[PDB]
Coordinates of C-alpha atoms in Angstrom, one line a residue:
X1 CA 149.9 116.7 49.5
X2 CA 148.9 113.3 50.8
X3 CA 145.4 112.7 52.3
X4 CA 144.5 109.9 54.7
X5 CA 141.1 108.7 55.8
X6 CA 139.8 105.4 57.2
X7 CA 139.3 103.3 54.2
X8 CA 142.7 104.5 52.8
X9 CA 144.4 103.6 56.2
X10 CA 142.6 100.2 56.6
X11 CA 143.4 99.2 53.0
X12 CA 147.1 99.9 53.6
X13 CA 147.2 98.0 56.9
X14 CA 145.1 95.0 55.7
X15 CA 147.6 94.7 52.8
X16 CA 150.4 95.1 55.3
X17 CA 152.2 97.8 53.2
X18 CA 154.6 99.9 55.3
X19 CA 155.4 102.1 52.2
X20 CA 151.7 103.3 52.0
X21 CA 152.1 104.9 55.4
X22 CA 154.5 107.5 54.0
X23 CA 153.1 111.0 54.8
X24 CA 150.7 109.7 57.5
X25 CA 152.7 111.2 60.4
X26 CA 152.9 114.6 58.6
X27 CA 149.2 114.5 57.8
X28 CA 148.1 113.7 61.3
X29 CA 150.3 116.5 62.6
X30 CA 149.3 119.2 60.1
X31 CA 145.6 118.3 60.5
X32 CA 145.9 117.9 64.2
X33 CA 144.5 114.3 64.2
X34 CA 145.3 111.0 66.0
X35 CA 144.9 107.3 65.2
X36 CA 142.5 107.0 68.1
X37 CA 140.1 109.6 66.6
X38 CA 136.7 108.2 65.7
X39 CA 137.3 108.9 62.0
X40 CA 140.2 106.5 62.1
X41 CA 138.3 103.8 64.1
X42 CA 135.8 101.3 62.8
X43 CA 132.4 102.7 64.0
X44 CA 130.9 99.2 64.4
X45 CA 133.6 97.8 66.7
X46 CA 135.8 100.6 68.0
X47 CA 138.9 99.0 66.3
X48 CA 141.7 101.3 65.3
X49 CA 144.2 100.1 62.6
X50 CA 146.3 98.2 65.1
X51 CA 143.8 95.3 65.6
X52 CA 143.3 95.4 61.9
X53 CA 147.1 95.0 61.2
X54 CA 147.3 92.2 63.8
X55 CA 144.4 90.4 62.2
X56 CA 146.2 90.6 58.7
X57 CA 149.5 89.0 59.0
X58 CA 151.6 87.6 56.2
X59 CA 154.0 84.9 57.4
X60 CA 153.3 86.0 61.0
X61 CA 154.1 89.7 60.4
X62 CA 152.5 93.0 59.4
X63 CA 155.2 95.6 59.0
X64 CA 152.9 98.5 59.3
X65 CA 152.8 97.7 63.0
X66 CA 156.1 99.2 64.1
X67 CA 155.4 102.3 61.9
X68 CA 151.9 102.8 63.4
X69 CA 153.3 102.6 67.0
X70 CA 156.0 105.2 66.3
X71 CA 153.5 107.5 64.6
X72 CA 151.1 107.2 67.6
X73 CA 154.1 108.1 69.8
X74 CA 155.0 111.1 67.8
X75 CA 151.4 112.3 68.0
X76 CA 151.5 112.1 71.8
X77 CA 149.1 109.2 71.5
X78 CA 150.9 105.9 72.1
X79 CA 149.3 104.4 75.2
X80 CA 145.8 105.4 74.1
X81 CA 146.4 103.9 70.6
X82 CA 147.9 100.6 72.0
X83 CA 145.1 100.2 74.5
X84 CA 142.1 101.4 72.4
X85 CA 139.3 99.0 73.3
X86 CA 137.0 97.3 70.7
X87 CA 134.0 95.0 70.8
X88 CA 132.3 92.3 68.8
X89 CA 129.2 90.1 69.7
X90 CA 131.2 88.1 72.3
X91 CA 133.4 90.6 74.2
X92 CA 133.8 94.2 74.9
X93 CA 137.1 95.9 76.2
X94 CA 139.4 93.7 74.0
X95 CA 142.7 95.3 73.0
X96 CA 145.6 94.6 70.5
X97 CA 147.4 92.6 73.2
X98 CA 144.5 90.1 73.5
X99 CA 144.7 89.6 69.7
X100 CA 148.5 89.2 69.7
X101 CA 148.1 86.5 72.4
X102 CA 145.1 84.7 70.8
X103 CA 147.0 84.7 67.4
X104 CA 150.0 83.2 69.3
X105 CA 152.3 86.1 68.3
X106 CA 154.9 86.4 71.1
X107 CA 156.9 89.0 69.1
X108 CA 153.9 91.4 68.9
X109 CA 153.0 90.6 72.5
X110 CA 156.5 91.8 73.5
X111 CA 156.5 94.9 71.3
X112 CA 153.1 96.0 72.6
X113 CA 154.0 95.4 76.3
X114 CA 157.4 97.2 75.7
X115 CA 155.4 100.3 74.4
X116 CA 152.9 100.4 77.2
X117 CA 150.2 97.8 76.6
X118 CA 147.8 97.4 79.6
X119 CA 148.7 93.9 80.8
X120 CA 145.5 93.8 82.8
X121 CA 143.0 94.9 80.1
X122 CA 139.7 93.0 80.5
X123 CA 137.9 91.4 77.6
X124 CA 134.5 91.2 79.2
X125 CA 131.9 88.8 78.0
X126 CA 128.7 90.1 76.4
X127 CA 125.4 88.3 76.7
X128 CA 121.9 88.6 75.1
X129 CA 119.7 86.2 77.1
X130 CA 117.9 87.3 80.3
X131 CA 120.6 85.3 82.2
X132 CA 124.2 85.0 80.6
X133 CA 123.9 82.2 78.1
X134 CA 127.7 81.7 77.8
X135 CA 128.1 82.4 74.1
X136 CA 131.6 83.7 74.5
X137 CA 134.7 81.5 75.2
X138 CA 135.5 82.4 78.8
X139 CA 139.2 82.6 79.5
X140 CA 139.2 84.9 82.6
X141 CA 139.2 88.3 80.8
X142 CA 142.8 89.2 81.4
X143 CA 145.9 88.8 79.1
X144 CA 147.7 86.3 81.4
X145 CA 144.6 84.2 81.9
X146 CA 144.2 84.0 78.0
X147 CA 147.8 82.9 77.6
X148 CA 147.3 80.1 80.3
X149 CA 143.9 79.0 78.9
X150 CA 145.3 78.9 75.3
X151 CA 148.3 76.8 76.5
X152 CA 151.0 79.4 75.8
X153 CA 153.6 79.0 78.6
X154 CA 156.2 81.2 76.9
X155 CA 153.8 84.1 76.9
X156 CA 152.8 83.3 80.4
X157 CA 156.6 83.5 81.3
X158 CA 157.1 86.7 79.3
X159 CA 154.0 88.4 80.8
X160 CA 155.0 87.6 84.4
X161 CA 158.8 87.9 84.1
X162 CA 159.5 90.8 81.6
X163 CA 161.6 93.8 82.5
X164 CA 159.0 96.4 81.5
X165 CA 155.6 95.7 82.9
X166 CA 154.5 92.5 84.5
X167 CA 151.1 90.9 84.6
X168 CA 150.2 90.0 88.1
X169 CA 149.5 86.2 88.8
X170 CA 147.1 87.3 91.7
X171 CA 145.0 89.5 89.5
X172 CA 141.2 88.8 89.5
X173 CA 138.8 89.6 86.7
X174 CA 135.2 91.0 86.8
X175 CA 134.0 87.7 88.4
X176 CA 136.8 87.7 91.0
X177 CA 138.4 84.9 89.1
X178 CA 142.2 84.5 89.2
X179 CA 144.1 82.5 86.4
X180 CA 143.5 79.3 88.4
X181 CA 139.7 80.0 88.5
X182 CA 139.8 80.5 84.7
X183 CA 141.8 77.2 84.2
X184 CA 138.9 75.5 86.1
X185 CA 136.4 77.3 83.8
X186 CA 138.0 76.0 80.6
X187 CA 138.6 72.5 82.1
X188 CA 136.3 70.1 80.4
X189 CA 136.9 66.5 81.6
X190 CA 138.6 65.1 78.5
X191 CA 142.1 63.7 79.0
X192 CA 144.3 66.1 77.0
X193 CA 142.5 69.0 78.5
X194 CA 142.9 67.7 82.1
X195 CA 146.6 67.2 81.1
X196 CA 147.4 70.8 80.3
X197 CA 145.1 72.6 82.6
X198 CA 146.7 70.6 85.5
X199 CA 150.2 71.3 84.3
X200 CA 149.5 75.0 83.9
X201 CA 147.7 75.2 87.2
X202 CA 150.7 73.6 89.0
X203 CA 153.2 75.8 87.0
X204 CA 151.4 79.0 88.1
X205 CA 151.0 78.0 91.8
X206 CA 154.8 77.5 92.1
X207 CA 155.5 80.7 90.1
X208 CA 153.3 82.6 92.5
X209 CA 154.9 81.1 95.7
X210 CA 158.3 82.0 94.1
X211 CA 157.4 85.7 93.4
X212 CA 154.8 86.2 96.2
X213 CA 155.8 83.7 98.9
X214 CA 153.4 85.5 101.3
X215 CA 150.4 84.5 99.1
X216 CA 148.6 81.1 98.4
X217 CA 147.1 81.6 94.9
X218 CA 144.5 78.8 95.3
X219 CA 143.2 80.4 98.5
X220 CA 142.1 83.6 96.7
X221 CA 138.3 83.6 96.3
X222 CA 136.0 84.7 93.5
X223 CA 132.8 86.6 93.9
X224 CA 130.8 83.4 94.6
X225 CA 133.2 83.0 97.6
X226 CA 134.8 79.9 96.0
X227 CA 138.4 78.9 95.7
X228 CA 139.5 77.2 92.5
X229 CA 139.1 73.8 94.3
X230 CA 135.5 74.6 95.3
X231 CA 134.5 76.1 92.0
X232 CA 135.9 72.9 90.4
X233 CA 133.6 70.8 92.6
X234 CA 130.5 73.0 92.1
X235 CA 130.9 72.9 88.3
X236 CA 131.8 69.1 88.0
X237 CA 135.4 69.6 87.0
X238 CA 136.3 66.1 88.3
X239 CA 139.7 66.0 86.6
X240 CA 141.1 69.3 88.0
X241 CA 139.4 68.7 91.4
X242 CA 140.9 65.2 91.9
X243 CA 144.3 66.6 90.8
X244 CA 144.2 69.4 93.4
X245 CA 142.9 67.1 96.1
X246 CA 145.6 64.5 95.3
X247 CA 148.3 67.3 95.4
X248 CA 147.2 68.4 98.9
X249 CA 147.4 64.8 100.3
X250 CA 150.9 64.6 98.8
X251 CA 152.0 68.0 100.2
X252 CA 150.5 67.1 103.7
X253 CA 152.3 63.7 103.6

């Protein structure tokens, strides 16, 4: 009968071979194992085979993915499997959903949300200097904030509008930063950057006033006590700052 271990499983999933997964469910069941058990995770990083599949796509797809999710379900393990956190040198708490967004894979973003992905999982920055040296790309930790900061308006739409589990526009990360605070973080002052950050900022403000008319999104304050306007001024984000200021004169006029 058919044995699985970690290098067997990771070789199958990195090749993206659904057929090699035959007998895996039965094996897990008869041996009373799960895909989240340490022997099926990469000891160095915490990665299960799902991040592995999602990092080894062939024409945007890895057909082990649907089969892994179903196996996890049938082993009473689906939420845990989907949300198993991993780490590298830049972030801890990263999940499959973060990867699917970063890789720009809307189809896998949907699949994973549909099957119970944590839409608010935080990819928290790691640091090695006495004071945080900023070696990680800061995008506001959260799945929605990543989609905004990587200019993926369709994923931003899906995440906030889908019929299964919606990411909250008002959500704040470990720094108390909302999506608008994170868009100020990634703002450099180059013109194409000012272009999209500004468009995405304005898109999300409207979206929020539509869904949550009782809330001003740019009023919500991080743990420095700063709005996105004031954070923009403290950190020299001229472009986003002037845009916001210019919008307020318009909306007061």
